[PDB]
Description:
This protein is α+β, with helices and mostly antiparallel strands. The protein contains one helix and two strands; from the N terminus they run H-E-E. A hairpin with a 2-residue loop joins strand 1 and strand 2. The longest helix has 13 residues, at about 15-25. The chain is extended, with a radius of gyration of 14 Å. The chain starts with 12 loop residues before the first helix and ends with a strand. It is found in: Cell projection, Dendritic spine; Cell membrane; Synapse; Postsynaptic cell membrane.
Amino acid sequence: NEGMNVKKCCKGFCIDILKKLSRTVKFTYDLYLVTNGKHGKKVNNVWNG
């Protein structure tokens, strides 16, 4: 279970909201992609996703 760091493009309503937030707060942003899960649930008292 070893991958890489391939660079892609993420677009959508959430991306537009994040861009507006960055423009208003005037601070930059670095965004990742979740690989462990989709949303995350408490399993073995450990949060994932």
